[PDB]
Symmetry: C2
Subunit: 187 residues, 2 copies
């Protein structure tokens, strides 16, 4: 009955873009699984914050399917996601089953690497735009949060709450989103 | 030299109110030490995100003094901070040395527990106002970020960026604060 979310955590991930969505989704009653790309070991994020995943991606991948697969940003983190064959398979399967895919900041560049959702209108961190647009497989947007069907993208740490709340609305509805939002004291 | 910051991490701390300041301060070139209240073991935050401290508070306390002591929020986390004799001593020392003390959400209630900065104008998460105002030792504010001398407070996850940038400006200046802010893509 409860929606499930898979958050793929790789070394170099932007910790704020990882923690805000995980926190907000759990406030929404979503069962969130933080899966480590390299395994079950703790992950050293971009600003040295060390986060211990709930499980390895290899294991979490066997506990699917998920209502949403979340790709945090962070330059080095995104590169790790982009080079992962496991991630490629996870996203292809999610896209095939018509499941939501959400990526923030540099995270969307992983979609390009795995040829996911070509033709979609997307946004990324301003510094990741060129990389994301290489080949013109997507149409760029400056919106803080962009949702084109089952592809949901966002721009950076500063858009993480909007990003997370958009995921919540897509999975649990806007009433729940509004309920979760109020206590956050967002402007 | 570079400024130093001490972030006291206790079980039940709100992970967003912990990670955002740590991340933003490090982007500001501030040497941040995430110290675990109970020790050097991983800490289970309010929304189950597990964070590994850089060191135990016991050891971090020996590497002082710090230019700012940061108290994250989270109902249960703030309660642990409020009940800690180690925290009481650290804050008293910081207050006596005229060093900055910054607390967010429920975090300010730890200031009350340790009789820190009485008379200061402060803010807290709306649900922590009554606890903070017990006895009328402070004057309450609705401002998203309140700074009365060396006592800096904020309201919640949604004010974490404002809170963190306020700390940066207080330690490294308005110029550095603006430089760090731009890449965040804040609204």
């Amino acid at each position: 009955a409860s929606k499930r979310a898979l958050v793929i955590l790789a070394k170099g991930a932007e910790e704020m873009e990882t923690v805000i969505p995980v926190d907000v989704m759990r406030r929404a009653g979503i069962k969130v699984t933080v899966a480590g790309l390299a395994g079950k070991d703790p992950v050293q994020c971009s600003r040295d914050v060390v986060i211990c995943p709930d499980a390895s991606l290899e294991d979490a991948k066997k506990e699917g399917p998920y209502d949403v697969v979340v790709l945090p940003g962070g330059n080095l983190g995104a590169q790790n996601l982009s080079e992962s064959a496991a991630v490629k398979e996870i996203l292809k399967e999610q896209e095939n089953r018509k499941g939501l895919i959400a990526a923030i900041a540099a995270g969307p560049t992983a979609l390009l690497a795995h040829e996911i959702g070509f033709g979609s209108k997307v946004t990324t961190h301003p510094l990741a735009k060129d990389k994301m647009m290489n080949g013109g497989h997507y149409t760029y947007s400056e919106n803080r949060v962009e949702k084109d069907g089952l592809i949901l993208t966002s721009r950076g740490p500063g858009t993480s709450f909007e990003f997370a709340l958009a995921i919540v609305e897509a999975l649990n509805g806007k009433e729940v989103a509004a309920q979760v939002k109020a206590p956050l004291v967002l402007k």
